[PDB]
Structure formats: structure tokens, C-alpha cells
Amino acid sequence: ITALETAIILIAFVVVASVFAFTILSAGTFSTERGKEAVYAGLSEVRSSIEIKGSVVIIGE
Amino acid sequence: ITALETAIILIAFVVVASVFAFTILSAGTFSTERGKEAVYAGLSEVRSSIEIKGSVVIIGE
Numbered sequence: 001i002t003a004l005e006t007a008i009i010l011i012a013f014v015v016v017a018s019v020f021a022f023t024i025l026s027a028g029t030f031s032t033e034r035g036k037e038a039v040y041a042g043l044s045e046v047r048s049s050i051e052i053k054g055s056v057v058i059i060g061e
Numbered sequence: 062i063t064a065l066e067t068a069i070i071l072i073a074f075v076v077v078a079s080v081f082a083f084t085i086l087s088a089g090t091f092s093t094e095r096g097k098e099a100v101y102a103g104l105s106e107v108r109s110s111i112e113i114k115g116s117v118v119i120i121g122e
Contacts, residue, residue, distance in 0.1 A: 005064075
């Protein structure tokens with residue numbers, strides 16, 4: 001009889017593998033998305049800056 | 062392939078998987094500490110200089 005029952009365990013191991021595979025795919029997309037987001041944020045930080053030109057003290061009276 | 066034997070191999074693979082994971086955890090902690098210690102040691106050496114101020118005097122006898 002080790003054939004009809006053999007099918008049943010076979011199906012169960014397939015299903016859990018597929019569901020497990022489903023979750024890795026979703027997790028991978030999220031993780032890589034955050035990675036590129038950090039690089040773009042870092043570059044914009046360095047590029048921004050400000051310079052100075054002159055110094056005048058006036059008096060209203 | 063009845064279910065009875067299938068359980069036993071399952072347990073064995075989990076245990077070796079667990080035991081291997083524990084070793085990685087401990088190993089990673091040690092390596093991290095040594096890397097941290099190297100940076101502190103390097104910084105201290107660079108900042109430990111000495112100067113000479115004034116002239117040099119010879120006392121004859």
C-alpha cells in the first residue's frame with residue numbers, strides 16, 4: 001500500500017515548500033527596495049550645501 | 062515510505078541545523094569584537110606624539 005499513502009506525504013511536502021518559496025520571494029523584494037533607497041538618500045545628503053558672501057551690520061537709528 | 066521513519070530523519074536534520082547555527086552565532090560575536098578593538102588601538106597610536114621645546118644644554122665637568 002506504500003504508494004497511495006506515499007502520494008499523500010508527497011503532496012504535503014510540495015505544498016509547504018511552495019508556500020515557503022512564496023514568502024522568500026516577497027521578502028526579497030522588500031529588502032532590495034530598502035537597499036537602493038538608502039543609496040539615493042545618502043547621495044543627496046552630500047550634494048546639498050551652502051556658501052557665504054559678505055557680512056553687514058546695520059542700525060535702524 | 063510510511064510517516065514513522067520520515068519523522069526521524071526530520072528531527073536529525075533539525076538538530077544538526079540548530080547546533081550549526083549556535084556555533085555561527087558565537088563565532089560571529091568573537092570576530093566582531095576583534096575588529097572593534099583594532100580600530101581603537103590604531104587611533105590611539107597616531108595621537109601620542111611628543112615635541113621638543115627650547116634649546117639643548119650641555120653641562121661641562
